[PDB]
Design a protein around this ligand. Structure first.
Ligand SMILES: N[C@@H](Cc1c[nH]c2ccccc12)C(=O)O
Ligand SMILES: N[C@@H](Cc1c[nH]c2ccccc12)C(=O)O
Ligand code: SF4
Ligand code: SF4
Lengths: 367, 367
């Protein structure tokens, strides 16, 4: 009975310590003092790492307003990969964090070749509207476009350009276009700019990411340090989540629709995707009942663990049964489906109103 | 009697035609129709080339407000190299052109490592104050800082990053840092942004440069073309001036003080620099009187031609005498000095008031 899977953690949690990334449990006593109980993603070890989130919670504890920031590429549809990020935002927002969400429409245009009108449409109706329907507060959340964020944010990007080398950027990105160079600096500015007085002066900011995104964060932290004497910036903190494996064994992508469920999928499309998902199940009903299934490798069990079963007892019960022989994939799938069906229907019923609201939460760029 | 020196023109004027650069004389009939008489720099062939300045003058002729734009690196002192640019601005401004001057303080910081406070000080007291004392109108001239120019200008730079390759930039600049990549895009935006409605909508803009600056202009023109469908931009026009050779035979630079006269040089410093200048004169007073001097190679004669003698008769008289044997360098130098002395004293007496005014012509960036 290891339902949370500490085993696969410990392995790289050794190597990430090299980058100053720590086990998330080291912040529990601070979470408590900050008046916060861990979210289920934290209890389950899905949020496994942090860097400097202690410093964030210390500020918060003494009454400082703290912030969380992330951004989204407005391309393709909003999926459960995206949902995992937003749920961390919602948890922090309910605990008093100021939330910033950047729309990466400059990067969309310049790196991904996405048209202006479409980037803006997708951002508002597919990203912001889904985040609102998920529960991000339309009034206190500050959404913005990279291309419409104002002089002091843009100044950072200009000044950061003097404080990084081609080689440092080549390390992070590989072979490096002007667009990618520009994207990299703008993203550091997305993270750091909220510390400027013109955007609220939030010195203490945490960014929720996957380990695979740390190199850009370390660059952003170096930029903050290298700006000493020009503008005073604190190194941003972070939390680290394991990435949810896709329904087809590979990473969730709008690119391959069967990898993931889109939050706008009609019930029949979603069910079919779910019933097609890879499992840790066996050759036949019969072999399953003798040995059991393998949840550690099962994408249905991961849907349960990351989204569909917030109750620890329910998901443990699924883990145990699967292993103990007591359950077949077909039934397991139908159980996850019924959680999914209800979440989708409540979600989609909020979505048309969220779209109306979304267009009023931002000023889209003129061109 | 070739005092204007067409000879050295024709040579490369062949090769620059490859880039679509034309002899400046092809625009005379348009200059006339636009209600403008050529400036002495134009009469003397010092402005030798143009690209698309016909299209500018056609707009102007039908009553459109046309613009000229250039920018300055706020580093070192304002010299007669800089003065030659500003005098072209002043001529255009008197003929109804809107003038924009960019201060390249982002490039100063990121490429040249110049501090923020100092870039800003130097820009205002050394560059803008000297331009005002020279006669640039403090009320109608729009001076701005790269780092303080606003969202729509910055958006261009973000979008341009998707429309140029590392190789195209490598061609212009050599090995290419993030700062240089950033400088190159910002400079295109300096030129193009005035076409946006938020900055006055000046579609028709001419940039006065030396031939050696054309590659960046061709890139800026390509960027305008490549933005079709995103923002409608006209290819900027240009005029081309020969560079004034330095007093020490080499190019004018704040780097080597004896190369040039600074507009703030006290009369004794300036005279000494002038009396030290390289000439086309001879071994001794005696050999000079037989053969003559060589004005084509003489940096005193070039001071006369570019600044000190706006009257064509006076400078021709210097050319002829020098050649005909009638004048020695010592006397020639003292004649140029007396023009210089008077120009400096009138100029410096306007400079303290221009400094006061200058601080009110711009909003310096916060950091
Ligand atoms: N570069 C990200 C989007 C992004 C822009 N700014 C950010 C800041 C934090 C996290 C992500 C981002 C992709 O996907
Ligand atoms: N890059 C130039 C300064 C500059 C910035 N923007 C410009 C636009 C036009 C001409 C020159 C500039 C140096 O010197
Ligand atoms: S019974 Fe459920 S947890 Fe076990 S392998 Fe099948 S789908 Fe996965
Ligand atoms: S006489 Fe004048 S123009 Fe002739 S070489 Fe001497 S300084 Fe130059």
């Amino acid at each position: 009975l290891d339902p949370w899977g500490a085993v696969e953690i410990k392995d790289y949690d050794r190597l990430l310590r090299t980058f100053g990334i720590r086990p998330f449990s080291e912040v529990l006593p601070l979470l408590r003092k900050a008046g916060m109980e861990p979210s289920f993603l934290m209890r389950r070890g899905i949020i496994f790492g942090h860097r400097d989130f202690d410093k964030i919670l210390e500020a918060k504890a003494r009454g400082e307003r703290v912030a969380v920031l992330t951004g989204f590429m407005p391309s393709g549809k909003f999926h459960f990969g995206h949902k995992l990020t937003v749920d961390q935002l919602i948890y922090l927002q309910k605990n008093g964090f100021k939330v910033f969400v950047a729309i990466a429409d400059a990067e969309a245009f310049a790196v991904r070749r996405i048209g202006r009108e479409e980037a803006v449409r997708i951002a508002v109706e597919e990203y912001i509207a889904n985040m609102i329907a998920l529960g991000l507060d339309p009034k206190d959340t500050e959404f913005y476009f990279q291309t419409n964020r104002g002089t002091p944010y843009f100044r950072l990007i200009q000044l950061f350009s003097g404080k990084v080398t081609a080689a440092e950027m080549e390390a992070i990105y590989g072979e490096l276009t002007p667009a990618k160079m520009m994207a990299s600096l703008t993203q550091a500015a997305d993270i750091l700019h909220v510390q400027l007085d013109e955007y609220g002066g939030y010195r203490h900011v945490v960014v929720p990411v996957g380990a695979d995104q740390d190199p850009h964060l370390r660059l952003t932290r170096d930029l903050a340090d290298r700006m000493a004497g020009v503008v005073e910036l604190e190194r941003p903190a972070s939390t680290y989540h394991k990435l949810q494996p896709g329904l087809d064994g590979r990473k969730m992508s709008s690119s391959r629709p069967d990898s993931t469920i889109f939050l706008t999928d009609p019930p029949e499309v979603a069910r079919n995707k779910l019933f097609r998902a890879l499992t840790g199940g066996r050759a036949t009903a019969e072999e399953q009942r003798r040995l059991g299934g393998v949840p550690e490798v099962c994408s249905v069990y991961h849907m349960d663990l990351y989204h569909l079963m917030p109750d620890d007892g329910e998901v443990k019960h699924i883990y145990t049964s699967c292993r103990l022989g007591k359950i077949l994939c077909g039934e397991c799938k139908q159980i996850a489906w019924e959680k999914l069906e209800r979440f989708l229907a409540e979600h989609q019923s909020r979505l048309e109103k969220a779209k109306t609201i979304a267009w009023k939460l931002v000023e889209p760029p003129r061109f």
